[PDB]
Design a protein around this nucleic acid. Structure first.
Ligand SMILES: [K+]
Ligand SMILES: [K+]
Ligand SMILES: [Mg+2]
Ligand SMILES: [Mg+2]
Ligand SMILES: [Mg+2]
Ligand SMILES: [Mg+2]
Ligand SMILES: [Mg+2]
Ligand SMILES: [Mg+2]
Ligand SMILES: [Mg+2]
Ligand SMILES: [Mg+2]
Ligand SMILES: [Mg+2]
Ligand SMILES: [Mg+2]
Ligand SMILES: [Mg+2]
Ligand SMILES: [Mg+2]
Ligand SMILES: [Mg+2]
Lengths: 117, 206, 202
RNA sequence: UGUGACCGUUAGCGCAUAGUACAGUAAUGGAAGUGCAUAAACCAAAUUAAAGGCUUAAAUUAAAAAUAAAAUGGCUGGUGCAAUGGCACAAAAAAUAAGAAAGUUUAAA
RNA sequence: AAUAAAUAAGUUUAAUACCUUUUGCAGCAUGGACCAGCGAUUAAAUGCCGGUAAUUAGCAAAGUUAAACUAACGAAAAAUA
RNA sequence: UAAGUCAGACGCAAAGCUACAAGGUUUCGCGUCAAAAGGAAAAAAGUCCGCCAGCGAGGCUAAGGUACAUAAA
């Protein structure tokens, strides 16, 4: 069981008797910590959902689809993840379009260490 | 002070010699936390009510018969093996050149505490004669000793007579006469004794 | 941390209290003064001695020994209060103790052989630490307490400690010299004690 | 009188004096209550925050000291510290027994 | 069930107290208005089973108590002579 | 372990009793709950997928889904 010092440290921002009354605050502290365990798990699901929405919106502006892009990347051996792809569509439109064109049309110029073999 | 000095402030016991007691009813995460490990309800979990031997009403232990045979009184004698008697002689704790009596056995340590007498039993292969006086003997011991040329005598002593045999100094230091020997034994014990013991035994050569 | 010869006899000089000078030399048996030091045996004997000295004159009162409390204080049913049977119950302020204290002894037993092992360990430890000294006598040539203190200080100058323990052959020993030593020793001396060899303990 | 890994004002005797106050026709039952000091619950008060342009080359200092919010006002009497109060036995002393029945004993110089 | 996880600070999503008792309780089953103090497997003797040591134990002081032990089939032949 | 337990529940599949009724009752085979958080079906003890030591804004899948609510043709 938490001590008085621990209980009141956790409950410093609670309302009414939940702030300074031990019996009321103790039950409010434990229930909140239970919410936090669930909250951390759900955070990872929600953020990935947001990335996909932004990628899909960018793809459809050019006439493409999210599912077509993911399949196309795996055929080209491109391993950029969704967090990076989401950020490219928002902040680097020109680079995001270049990735789409390579996947759809494959018209990029290859680079070799020895330019003149 | 150096590190190797010993004082009252750095003593500990040997590991494993002690273990902490279990104090129950002291928290959810403690051993035997809430209910003290007794369960939830019932007669067992309500204090001193039930004896550990009650079987529910069947009472199976008293469904067996009773025997009333009386064991022989000779279970009250101290038992001495012939093989143990020889070992003492070989080590030198007993003198085999003179008659051996129960007093010598008591002092040598063969017999621990005598209240009634000594019973001699067992088989042993001897090469030298032995003369021993005891209160009782079997047939295996008699044959073993006599085969080498010894003599086994069963001597009859009373309660007062046995005390004089074992602790004569207890009477001389107080200037008291020794107990007198018995006259004869009851005929019901015929075939149990060969002679009446003398409080000061007569030692002979072997 | 240094080399020790176990079970070997020791040669120890003898000093004089009156002047602090060496007078002769003697020998210490190796089985008593050069034995192994058992740390666990010392712990057991120390606990054994402390338990024996505890007095144990302590008592409390339970609900049957507190004054009053015979009658039932409330009706069993109807009042809306908790059911109660007596005012001297442990649950009530001013009630009895659930498990009262009783006058008791705290002493337990040890074999006489284990006590011997402890004494040898303690004597051996002193010799290996250089805290053991032998003198011819304590009262010969000394007529004042200050004189004795100065002599003892000179003899034990090569040591780390401060307090001293003095062991003699008892009051009726050395021609009743012990009586003189007791008289000279001041009352309530916190750093000096005198014991007979019969009362030596770990 | 002596000792304590016995207690320190919800403890220890019911009592740091009280078998008092008080309840009851009565027998009887039976409290509270030491000294000092920013503890808790509890009720009132306390919301916010802004700022846009003097021209720069020969000071001062025996010695030392001296510029900054952890804490509102109350009511209450916990905790911490102390003992002119209790608990347990120990030592000494005291108390105590006779066979006989109107009858003799036991006194150290 | 008055919070949690985040946020461009505008908001968005997750989310029916605790205890006791039950096959099953957010329970329209039970207990708690709140704070401080008090409040519940303790002691003795004996027995059983693990662990750690002593290497019999207690008195006494060359002698005594307590415990423990005490006959089962005398069965081997390994010689490069 | 000389411990606890001897109030059990439902789903699919059989039989007796009831009326080839009951979230009924009595046996029996497997599973789940009881003592099991997480995902799907609206809320969801017992159905379907699957067993939580802790943290992370990495990735692949199961049951079930892929015009809006609501991630994906
Ligand atoms: K148990
Ligand atoms: K309150
Ligand atoms: Mg039950
Ligand atoms: Mg039970
Ligand atoms: Mg009291
Ligand atoms: Mg106080
Ligand atoms: Mg009081
Ligand atoms: Mg029910
Ligand atoms: Mg209520
Ligand atoms: Mg039953
Ligand atoms: Mg049943
Ligand atoms: Mg049913
Ligand atoms: Mg249950
Ligand atoms: Mg995938
Ligand atoms: Mg969508």
């Amino acid at each position: 069981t938490f001590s008085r010092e621990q209980v009141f440290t956790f409950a410093k921002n609670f309302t009414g008797r939940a702030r300074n009354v031990y019996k009321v605050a103790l039950r409010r502290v434990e229930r909140g910590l239970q919410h936090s365990y669930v909250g951390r798990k759900e955070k990872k699901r929600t953020i990935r959902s947001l990335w996909i929405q932004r990628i899909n919106a960018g793809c459809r502006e050019h006439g493409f689809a999210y599912s077509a892009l993911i399949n196309g990347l795996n055929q080209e051996n491109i391993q950029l993840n969704r967090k990076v792809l989401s950020e490219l569509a928002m902040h680097e439109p020109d680079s995001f379009k270049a990735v789409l064109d390579q996947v759809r049309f494959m018209k990029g110029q290859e680079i070799y260490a020895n330019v003149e073999p | 002070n150096p590190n190797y000095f010993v004082h009252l402030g750095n003593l500990r016991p040997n590991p494993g010699a002690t273990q902490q007691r279990i104090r129950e009813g002291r928290g959810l995460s403690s051993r035997r936390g809430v209910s003290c490990g007794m369960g939830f309800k019932g007669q067992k979990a309500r204090g001193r009510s039930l004896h550990m031997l009650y079987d529910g009403g069947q009472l199976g232990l008293v469904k067996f018969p009773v025997t009333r045979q009386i064991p022989s009184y000779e279970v009250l004698y101290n038992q001495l093996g012939v093989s143990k008697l020889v070992e003492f002689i070989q080590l030198g704790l007993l003198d085999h050149t003179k008659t051996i009596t129960m007093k010598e056995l008591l002092n040598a340590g063969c017999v621990s505490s005598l209240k009634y007498g000594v019973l001699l039993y067992g088989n042993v292969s001897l090469s030298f004669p032995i003369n021993i006086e005891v209160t009782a003997c079997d047939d295996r011991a008699r044959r073993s000793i006599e085969a080498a040329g010894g003599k086994v005598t069963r001597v009859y002593y009373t309660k007062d007579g046995l005390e004089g045999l074992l602790f004569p100094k207890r009477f001389t230091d107080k200037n008291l006469p020794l107990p007198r020997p018995a006259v004869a034994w009851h005929p019901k014990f015929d075939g149990k004794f060969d002679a009446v013991g003398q409080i000061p035994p007569v030692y002979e050569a072997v | 941390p240094f080399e020790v010869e176990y079970h070997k006899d020791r040669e120890i000089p003898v000093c004089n209290v009156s002047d602090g000078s060496q007078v002769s030399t003697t020998t210490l048996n190796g089985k008593i003064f050069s034995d192994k030091v058992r740390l666990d045996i010392l712990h057991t004997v120390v606990r054994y001695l402390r338990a024996k000295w505890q007095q144990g004159t302590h008592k409390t009162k339970d609900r049957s020994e507190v004054s009053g409390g015979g009658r039932k204080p409330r009706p069993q049913k109807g009042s809306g209060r908790s059911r109660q049977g007596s005012i001297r119950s442990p649950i009530w302020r001013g009630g009895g103790c659930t498990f009262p204290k009783i006058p008791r002894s705290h002493a337990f037993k040890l074999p006489r052989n284990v006590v011997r092992i402890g004494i040898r360990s303690a004597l051996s430890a002193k010799a290996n630490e250089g805290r053991l000294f032998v003198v011819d006598s304590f009262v010969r040539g000394v007529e004042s307490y200050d004189q004795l203190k100065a002599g003892l200080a000179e003899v034990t100058k090569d040591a780390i400690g401060e307090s001293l323990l003095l062991v003699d052959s008892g009051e009726c020993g050395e021609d009743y010299s012990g009586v003189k030593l007791r008289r000279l020793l001041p009352k309530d001396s916190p750093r000096v004690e005198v014991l007979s060899y019969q009362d030596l303990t770990v």
